Nucleic acid binder design. Structure first.
Ligand SMILES: Nc1ccn([C@H]2C[C@H](O)[C@@H](COP(=O)(O)OP(=O)(O)OP(=O)(O)O)O2)c(=O)n1
Ligand SMILES: [Ca+2]
Ligand SMILES: [Ca+2]
Length: 430
DNA sequence: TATGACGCT
DNA sequence: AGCGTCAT
């Protein structure tokens, strides 16, 4: 009863940039602003594959992982920006550099966990305690939360979406609990005020807009962030969880959007995250293993302990390129030349990482996919990485894969390779 | 039809 | 060490 721990100890936020690559291209070319546009890789085959879509283009049905030519059928006016192409492949430097712009601003407020190229988690527990000590005992104005949604509000006893927002926000604040410095709901509100500021700083200093979620753990923050995209942040309180989860498809919770989540649905015979509450921890552990059972048991109650790991920099640096279908590499000269092209971009990126971040990678991993193989990776081998030389790395990458060539005729290469991937890991300080 | 983090064995 | 899962 009192020994019920409710996972309200932390204040955690997930910040995520709205249509990130599109914003980056639109800062650079003002003509793309406020217009249906998408970002594509390559152009010859079907106009290129789309990887990012503005919200105006989304109104027409334009999605990621779609050919530009098909996109132009749903949206004739759609504008396109192309990813920079280097050494025969896509080069994403523009977007990685835009990312450190954002991560460095976010780092001044709290320590972040780089989660992707455009999203970071933030643990605001410490920042919130201090704000509570400066706001003495004085209340929190709705003017401090100009873009915040309180999930599940308004409730109880105006039909444009901004009027709703203030109604729920007023309800939340007018019932707030400012006399207690340990009230979890008051802490989420202070965290939300901090994130409004974080988000105004990112836009002030990059011109990029984002959404955020604020709650007690990474999972809820992440789910919360997506409730009011774009350019809005959503506070998900501990108390909103039973209603929020009662109709939430299990696949929507982070790590349940794949196979494990599908077997939760098929085995247990449920649909929504809330239905998990009727199962005991021992039942769940028998169904899915000690780790999954324990984590499933806590999570449907809104409790999750996976911490915000202080890590602003990737553990891994890698380049890949698919050669699907008839483009599959089928000679020794092809395989070596693309390994060289990949090795060359990787060396460009590693030298920059060494100067910037005072570290060197020590292991090189070569992954390949042969033609006729449902698995995304067919083979993965590693060797030492001792000089940032592209000709050595491509040589070593070949040496460790050459054994995979079926063909007895030595000049050709079978089975044809549909994918090459070089990857620098095992960093050491420098 | 380009990337990164982590678990399991 | 190497494969599998889950995500942006
Ligand atoms: N399968 C993917 C997913 C993402 N990205 C890149 C392009 C995106 O712009 C960026 C961030 O991905 P998101 O999943 O956050 O989606 P967006 O940021 O594009 O838009 P939004 O978050 O508003 O949906 O990462 C990619 O190249 N391939
Ligand atoms: Ca995003
Ligand atoms: Ca994202």
């Amino acid at each position: 009863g009192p020994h019920m721990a409710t996972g309200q100890d932390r204040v955690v936020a997930l910040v995520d940039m709205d249509c990130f690559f599109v914003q980056v291209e639109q800062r650079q070319n003002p003509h793309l602003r406020n217009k249906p546009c998408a970002v594509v890789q390559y152009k010859s085959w079907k106009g290129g594959g789309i990887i990012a879509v503005s919200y105006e283009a989304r109104a027409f049905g334009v999605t990621r992982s779609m050919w530009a030519d098909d996109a132009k059928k749903l949206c004739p006016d759609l504008l396109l920006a192309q990813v920079r192409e280097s050494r025969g492949k896509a080069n994403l430097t523009k977007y990685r550099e835009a990312s450190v712009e954002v991560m460095e601003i976010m780092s001044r407020f709290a320590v972040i966990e780089r989660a992707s190229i455009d999203e970071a988690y933030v643990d605001l527990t410490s920042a919130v305690q201090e704000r509570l000590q400066k706001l003495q005992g004085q209340p929190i104005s709705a003017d401090l939360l100009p873009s915040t949604y309180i999930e599940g509000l308004p409730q109880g006893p105006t039909v444009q979406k901004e009027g709703m927002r203030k109604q729920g926000l007023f309800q939340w604040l007018d019932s707030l609990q400012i006399d207690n410095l340990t009230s979890p709901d008051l802490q989420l509100t202070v965290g939300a005020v901090i994130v409004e500021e974080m988000r105004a700083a990112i836009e002030r200093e990059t011109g990029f807009q984002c959404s955020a979620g604020i709650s007690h753990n990474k999972v809820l923050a992440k789910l919360a962030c997506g409730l009011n995209k774009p350019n809005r942040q959503t506070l998900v309180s501990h108390g909103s969880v039973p209603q929020l989860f009662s109709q939430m498809p299990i696949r929507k919770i982070r790590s349940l959007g794949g196979k494990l989540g599908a077997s939760v649905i098929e085995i247990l015979g449920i649909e929504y995250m809330g239905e998990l509450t009727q199962f005991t921890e021992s039942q769940l552990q028998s169904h899915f293993g000690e780790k999954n059972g324990s984590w499933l048991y806590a999570m449907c109650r809104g409790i999750e302990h996976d911490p915000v790991k202080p890590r602003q920099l990737p553990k891994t640096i890698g380049c890949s390129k698919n050669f699907p279908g008839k483009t599959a590499l089928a000679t020794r000269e092809q395989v070596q030349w693309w390994l060289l092209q990949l090795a060359q971009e990787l060396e460009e990126r590693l030298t920059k990482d060494r100067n910037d971040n005072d570290r060197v990678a020590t292991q090189l991993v070569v992954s390949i996919r042969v033609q006729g193989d449902k698995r995304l990776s067919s083979l993965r081998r590693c060797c030492a990485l001792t000089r940032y030389d592209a000709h050595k790395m491509s040589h070593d990458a070949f040496t460790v894969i050459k054994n995979c060539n079926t063909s007895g005729i030595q000049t050709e290469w079978s089975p044809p390779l549909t994918m090459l991937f070089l990857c620098a890991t095992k960093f050491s300080a420098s």
